């Protein structure tokens, strides 16, 4: 149940993992709940960053590993994603 993984900090990762470490599902990068935020789909570099009309894990800001925005009990926060490192 793992079958792609990310190299380095996952900045080049473009798979379809959409769950965080707590088992919550990612919000879409084009969600209306994210108006105000920098790392959405309306970012001018969304294209290059892989932020689009989807809720797949991305690392567009140079963080540790792929992450996404989530809701933890109706609160908007973000979280690292459950993608295995290719180094395990």
> What residues make contact with Cl ion under the rule CB under 5 A?
37-39
The distance of closest approach from Cβ of residue 78 to Cl ion in the complex, given in angstroms and rounded to an integer, is 7
As beta bridge partners, residue 19 has 25
- Closest to Cl ion by CB, 72 vs 86, is 72
- Closest to Cl ion by CB, 5 vs 37, is 37
Place of tokens 């892989």: 50
- Closest to Cl ion by CB, 38 vs 48, is 38
**Taking Cα atoms as reference points, which of 72, 46, 59 lies closest to residue 8?**
59
The distance of closest approach from Cβ of residue 3 to Cl ion in the complex, given in angstroms and rounded to an integer, is 28
Between CA 42 and CA 33 the distance in angstroms is: 13
């Amino acid at each position: 149940g793992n079958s792609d993984c990310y190299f380095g900090n996952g900045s080049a990762y473009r798979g379809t993992h959409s769950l965080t470490e707590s088992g919550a599902s990612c919000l879409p990068w084009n969600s209306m709940i994210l108006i105000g935020k920098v790392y959405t789909a309306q970012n001018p570099s969304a294209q290059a960053l892989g932020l689009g009309k989807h809720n797949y894990c991305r690392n567009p800001d140079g963080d540790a590993k792929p992450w996404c925005h989530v809701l933890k009990n109706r609160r908007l926060t973000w979280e690292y994603c459950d993608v295995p490192s290719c180094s395990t």
